[PDB]
């Protein structure tokens, strides 16, 4: 019933390709929800201007 989220923000010196290296992720959040999960999605900001 806890939804844990770890995260890390590293700066690449590329724009959009997966690099190589080691970087450990530090815990961010903890939510005592109870929710069941089986699926997920993503959200994007369109092109309009």
């Amino acid at each position: 019933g806890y939804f844990k989220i770890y995260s890390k923000h590293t700066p690449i010196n590329l724009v959009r390709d997966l690099p190589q290296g080691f970087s450990a992720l530090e815990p961010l959040v903890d939510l005592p929800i109870g929710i069941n999960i089986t699926r997920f999605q993503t959200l994007l900001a369109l092109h309009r201007s």
């Binding site: 019933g1 806890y2 005592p32 109870g34």
Partner: protein, 49 residues
């Protein structure tokens, strides 16, 4: 109820609040408060952090 200020007790309005604690099957939730005392130093002590 036509309540009026010159009513004998037992006909005057009473406000009621009913607290109902429930325990479904989650991981945890709200509870009483905690009381932290003073923290000594340099003495064999029995501690709880």
């Amino acid at each position: 109820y036509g309540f009026q200020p010159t009513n004998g007790v037992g006909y005057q309005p009473y406000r009621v609040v009913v607290l109902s604690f429930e325990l479904l099957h989650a991981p945890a939730t709200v509870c009483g408060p905690k009381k932290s005392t003073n923290l000594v130093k340099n003495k064999c002590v029995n501690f709880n952090f």
